[PDB]
Amino acid sequence: GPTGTGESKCPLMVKVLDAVRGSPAINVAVHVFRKAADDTWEPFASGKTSESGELHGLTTEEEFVEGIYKVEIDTKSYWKALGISPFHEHAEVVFTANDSGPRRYTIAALLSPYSYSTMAVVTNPKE
Amino acid sequence: GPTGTGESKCPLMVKVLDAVRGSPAINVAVHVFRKAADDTWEPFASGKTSESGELHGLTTEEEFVEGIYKVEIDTKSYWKALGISPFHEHAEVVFTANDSGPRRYTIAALLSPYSYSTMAVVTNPKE
Amino acid sequence: GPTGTGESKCPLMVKVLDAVRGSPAINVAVHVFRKAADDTWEPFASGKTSESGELHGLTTEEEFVEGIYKVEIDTKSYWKALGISPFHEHAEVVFTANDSGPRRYTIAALLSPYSYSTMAVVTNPKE
Amino acid sequence: GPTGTGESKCPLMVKVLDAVRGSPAINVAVHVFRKAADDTWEPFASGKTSESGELHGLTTEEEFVEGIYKVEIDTKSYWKALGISPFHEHAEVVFTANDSGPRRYTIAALLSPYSYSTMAVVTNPKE
């Protein structure tokens, strides 16, 4: 189910859209990683996007501490299902989550076979 | 209030994001137009985006008939408030709404001073 | 340079790329208009993109006067010739040009069936 | 052509543009890696973008062998030098290259503080 290591506060969400069909990208695998002091990527949270191309409950507020996180979207598998040959191996978003900055993090990604865009909406409220 | 000519079914919605600050673009004016047979743009619906950068209730299902619609976002005013000199006069999205194709229309726009992207998510459910 | 009506130093250039195929968008029709005194769009220049997805020689520096211009890219015909039913009728770029001296404008567009991004690169001439 | 380690026919090129200023992204650090046999990223090539926001001569056609490569763009340092606190640490592009013959790869990136788009243009060489 479109959730990860924290069905609660939802301080981090991922939304994936398909720019070829103009629909959400459903069942896309997403793996979230946290950088360890030994500077390697330790698995953190993961899941498959829902029917609306969203993924929530990846983490919890108490678990989501300041650090460097990497969100990796398996775009290649998604396009392969569609019978379309892609260019990227996957799409990744590497960022520093800080405490002073706003609360919630929505990472959106818009996919095309040879292109992808990603934006971050950082705010304080709900949705 | 972030609504237009139809606080009901919500067959058409507009979401605007600011890629410079990573927040929704609030209070952006949007004017929706419908093409008349005399092929001119007749005003249709309009509004200002909410705190979450969204605009709903622009129209109603019975009003939203097949045709060519133009969504015009006043990006220039938005950037001027921010004290940033923009390039575009505004951003526009011209499209043909058909009945066989999926139900709801979400038009999203991501703004930067010298660039803008727009995508359409056409589906059948809710959100 | 090549004055009168041709690329003196090519003050206006358009570059179009196909995001589904990883290639330049070839043979795309482009129409440029200029806001006329009476507040209407007068035909200014037109062309088709080359093998490199580019269009040069649309105007000259002497004719490219201060004004509001609209670059219209026939995205629809392009996608249709490919067997794809796009979402937008066209992509339009509206901007004020040369209001504080002659500049060189490169308008780029990245195309996907349900999405397009546009970017402007403005350069202050010399030789 | 210029073999050994230089742009024989420039099989790999990177182009970076600034979406906030309408200009090429100058002096941006770029690091290319290649997936090593042991499944780790080995340093392949590096450079900084020129005045045109471009980077050529990163490799040669004889050395640019079949493999999985990662183009890392130091977006963070760029935005910071400008007095802007960006969201991402960098922008990364991961792809398989030359698996069915040598191709020419142009990797473009459009940068905004909280957003970036990336596009690949693949060409089949000749002369």
Show Cβ contacts of residue B81 under 8 Å, excluding neighbours closer than 6 positions.
none
**Contacts of the segment C39-44: beta carbons below 8 A, 24+ positions apart:** C41/C70, C44/C69
Concatenating the DSSP letter of every residue in B18-68 gives ETTTTEE-TT-EEEEEEE-TT--EEEEEEEE--TTSEE--S--TTT--SEE
C54 bridge partner residues = C15
The first and second tokens of residue D95, run together, are 């792809």
Cα dist from A94 to B65, C16, D89, D116, whole Å: 44, 29, 6, 12
Show Cβ contacts of residue D103 under 8 Å, excluding neighbours closer than 6 positions.
D11, D97, D122, D123, D124, D125
The answer to whether A20 contacts C20, with C-beta atoms less than 8 Å apart, is yes
The answer to whether A94 contacts D115, with C-beta atoms less than 8 Å apart, is no
- Using what technique was this structure determined? X-ray
Option in A22, A117, A125 nearest B120 (CB): A22
Phi, then psi, of C76 in degrees rounded to 5? -50, -55
Please state, in angstroms and rounded to a whole number, the distance separating the CA atoms of residues A93 and D47.
22
Q: Name every residue in B having a CB less than 8 A away from some CB of A.
A: 17, 19, 22-24, 51-52, 110, 117, 119-123, 125, 127
The answer to whether C117 contacts B117, with C-beta atoms less than 8 Å apart, is yes
The answer to whether A113 contacts C19, with C-beta atoms less than 8 Å apart, is yes
Concatenating the DSSP letter of every residue in C6-42 gives S-SS-SEEEEEEETTTTEE-TT-EEEEEEE-TTSSEE
Helix (H) or strand (E) holding C117: strand C115-123
**Which parts of C are annotated binding residues for L-thyroxine?**
15, 54, 117
The answer to whether C119 contacts D24, with C-beta atoms less than 8 Å apart, is no
Q: Is B67 left (phi over 0), alpha (psi -120 to 50) or beta?
A: left
Q: Is B113 left (phi over 0), alpha (psi -120 to 50) or beta?
A: alpha
Please state, in angstroms and rounded to a whole number, the distance separating the CA atoms of residues A96 and D79.
15
CATH level 3 topology of A1-127 = Immunoglobulin-like (2.60.40)
CA nearest neighbour of C77 among C111, C106, C43:
C111
Which chain D residues are Cβ-neighbours of B19 within 8 angstroms? 19, 112-115
CB C8 within 8 A of CB C64: no
The answer to whether B19 contacts D110, with C-beta atoms less than 8 Å apart, is no
The answer to whether A87 contacts D120, with C-beta atoms less than 8 Å apart, is yes
Option in C19, C87, C114 nearest A115 (CB): C19
Question: Resolution for this model in angstroms, one decimal place?
Answer: 1.8
The answer to whether D119 contacts C19, with C-beta atoms less than 8 Å apart, is yes
Mutation choice for A interface testing from D94, D111, D116, D119 by most A CBs within 10 A: D94
The answer to whether A110 contacts B117, with C-beta atoms less than 8 Å apart, is yes
D110 to chain A: closest CA residue: A117
**Which parts of B are annotated binding residues for L-thyroxine?**
15, 54, 117
CA nearest neighbour of A73 among A59, A50, A58, A89:
A89
Please state, in angstroms and rounded to a whole number, the distance separating the CA atoms of residues D117 and D19.
10
Mutation choice for B interface testing from C39, C41, C92, C103 by most B CBs within 10 A: C92
Beta strands B104-112 and B12-18, pairing class: parallel
Helix (H) or strand (E) holding A75: helix A75-81
Q: Name every residue in A having a CB less than 8 A away from some CB of B.
A: 17, 19, 22-24, 51-52, 110, 117, 119-123, 125, 127
Using DSSP's 3-state secondary structure scheme, residue B8 falls into coil
Q: Is D54 annotated as a binding residue?
A: yes
Task: Give the gap in angstroms from C-alpha D115 to the nearest C-alpha of chain B.
Answer: 6
What's at C28, amino acid-wise? V
Task: Give the gap in angstroms from C-alpha D121 to the nearest C-alpha of chain A.
Answer: 8
What's at A32, amino acid-wise? V
Please state, in angstroms and rounded to a whole number, the distance separating the CA atoms of residues B67 and B88.
26
Concatenating the DSSP letter of every residue in D52-101 gives TSEE--S--TTTS-SEEEEEEE-HHHHHHHTT---SEEEEEEEEEESBTB
Which chain B residues are Cβ-neighbours of D119 within 8 angstroms? none
Option in C96, C115, C120 nearest B118 (CB): C115
Task: Give the gap in angstroms from C-alpha D38 to the nearest C-alpha of chain C.
Answer: 30
CB C95 within 8 A of CB C120: yes
